[PDB]
Amino acid sequence: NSVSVDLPGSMKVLVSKSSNADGKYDLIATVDALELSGTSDKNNGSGVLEGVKADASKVKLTISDDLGQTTLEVFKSDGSTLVSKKVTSKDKSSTHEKFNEKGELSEKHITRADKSSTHEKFNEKGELSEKHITRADKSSTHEKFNEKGELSEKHITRADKSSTHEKFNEKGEVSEKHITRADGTRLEYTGIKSDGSGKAKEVLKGYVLEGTLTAEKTTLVVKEGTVTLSKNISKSGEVSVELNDTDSSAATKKTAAWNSGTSTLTITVNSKKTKDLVFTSSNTITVQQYDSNGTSLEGSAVEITKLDEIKNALK
Fold first, then answer.
1. Number of alpha carbons in the 13 Å side-chain half-sphere of residue 273
2. How far apart are the C-alpha atoms of 100 and 79, rounded to whole Å?
3. Is 94:86 a contact under the CB 8 Å cutoff?
4. Chain mean position to CA 108
5. How many other CB atoms are there within 10 angstroms of residue 275's CB atom?
6. Over the chain, what HEC string results?
7. If we measure between CA atoms, which residue out of 53, 95, 96 comes closest to residue 75?
8. Cα dist. 119→87, 204, 217 in Å?
9. For residues 42 and 19, what is the distance between their CA atoms, to the nearest angstrom?
10. Cβ pair 92, 6 in contact under 8 A
């Protein structure tokens, strides 16, 4: 007396086995703890089923003739002013729409078979205020729009959980850029001027490096005495480090050479190597001393954990 066929949207329809009075098989379903009722001339499960919520919201479920699609709409008392709509296909793709208290589109979520998704939010003028695109690898593009329809903020996340976020001022210029690396370290670019120059902070485990940003490169600076160490990061993220010492004295002046194969800075004082500073691909720094004669390294490299240790290595 009751065949139940499952529908797209994780729903079920229970249909009469045969004609009752008229040649229409009965259909009843329960969606979100509410019972729906409708009559169709087919034995599929196809047709329409209507109901009324506790707050008098009108609910209508329409099942495609071929069972491949469901459309669940929540109207208001009038049956016209929409509250919510959900369209779900057999491949489990879905569209979920929310509407404001006026029936105008407020939000729209689209979900696909691979669990990729798009989320759109709309403002009181019907303009797209936010758009979130989430790919199947969990990579994402999140955009926020100002009242003029232009970008206020853009944030891109990659599959490895690295990210780049850009904030735009009222003139369309990037004013702040924040980067979170896959390993958890971070870059903060603030006060970006109209030529792309600005202030730069690299947040590492245990310490923060500070410096400047140009469109060309980022340069972080540590100073101790007359010694300035400059850590440069290219447009490509390539790290290169240089050192300059204004020390008058030829006996005490520090010079340094950069090894691009190892990302290692070798400091030298009075013709003898003193220490190797390694800038790891893990965005850490290690320091290892040379022997008395400065020809071979000694002991084991020790990871830098505070800014003062970098300065101590520059003394």
1. 18
2. 15
3. yes
4. 19
5. 20
6. CCEEEEECCCEEEEECCCCCCCCCEEEEEEECCEEEEEEECCCCCCEEEEEECCCCCEEEEEECCCCCEEEEEEECCCCCCEEEEEEEECCCCEEEEEECCCCCEEEEEEECCCCCEEEEEECCCCCEEEEEEECCCCCEEEEEECCCCCEEEEEEECCCCCEEEEEECCCCCEEEEEEECCCCCEEEEECCCCCCCEEEEEEECCEEEEEEECCCEEEEEEEECCEEEEEEEECCCCEEEEEEECCCCCCCCEEEEEECCCCEEEEEECCEEEEEEEECCCCCEEEEEECCCCCCECCCCEECCCHHHHHHHHC
7. 53
8. 15, 33, 35
9. 10
10. no
Residue with tokens 């979520």: 109
Experimental method of this PDB entry? X-ray
Query: So where are the chain's domains?
Result: 216-315
**How many residues are recorded in the chain?**
315
For 115-149, letters b (16+ CB in 10 Å) and e give ebbebbbbeeeeeebbbbbbbeeebbebbbbeeee
Q: For residues 93 and 80, what is the distance between their CA atoms, to the nearest angstrom?
A: 26
Domain 216-315, CATH among 3.90.930.1, 3.20.20.70, 3.40.50.300, 3.40.50.1100: 3.90.930.1
Only one residue has tokens 């300059």, namely 244
